[PDB]
Design a protein around this ligand. Structure first.
Ligand SMILES: [Tl+]
Ligand SMILES: [Tl+]
Ligand SMILES: [Tl+]
Ligand SMILES: [Tl+]
Ligand SMILES: [Tl+]
Ligand SMILES: [Tl+]
Ligand SMILES: [Tl+]
Ligand SMILES: [Tl+]
Ligand SMILES: [Tl+]
Length: 95
RNA sequence: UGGCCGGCAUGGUCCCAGCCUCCUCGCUGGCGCCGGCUGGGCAACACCAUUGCACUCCGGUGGUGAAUGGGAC
């Protein structure tokens, strides 16, 4: 069931008490050094809360981030990271 | 009061201060007691449920069942 490499990483187990806008800014803070980020998609709906899609421009970036930040304490919770199942439209509209 | 009716108590006007609050956060809002009818919203705050793969915002419930004193005429 393991996913294949993707420009986008999927993060979950994120503290749900954090507002969308702050969450996006914070995530960008810790993940930017891995490479250019095209966007970070967060939502608070029942189905999507506690998860986020950080979309990296280059898969290598999505790969260090995934290995380097796995389990990183963030807002008191261990961040769980994977590769997103399919592509993000921002990436389709290019690659 | 978010919108509305009743009961009771209470002389008036004004100044200061404190305080209160989901629905015009303040100095031309309110701040004796009690019952009842009933709308919006989850934006903020709180709580319940949720470990969930998206690229259209989008689960639920709760709060006003609130808050005092002094002074000048
Ligand atoms: Tl009311
Ligand atoms: Tl009355
Ligand atoms: Tl009097
Ligand atoms: Tl009086
Ligand atoms: Tl006031
Ligand atoms: Tl009443
Ligand atoms: Tl209501
Ligand atoms: Tl819908
Ligand atoms: Tl008084």
């Amino acid at each position: 069931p393991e996913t294949r490499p993707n420009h986008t990483i999927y993060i979950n187990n994120l503290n749900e008490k954090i507002k969308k806008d702050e969450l996006k800014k914070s995530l960008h803070a810790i993940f930017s050094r891995f490479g250019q980020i095209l966007d970070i998609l967060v939502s608070r709906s029942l189905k999507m809360r506690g998860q986020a899609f950080v979309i990296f421009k280059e898969v290598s970036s999505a790969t260090n981030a995934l290995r380097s930040m796995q389990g990183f304490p963030f807002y008191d919770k261990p961040m769980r990271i994977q590769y997103a199942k399919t592509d993000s439209d921002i990436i389709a509209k290019m690659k």
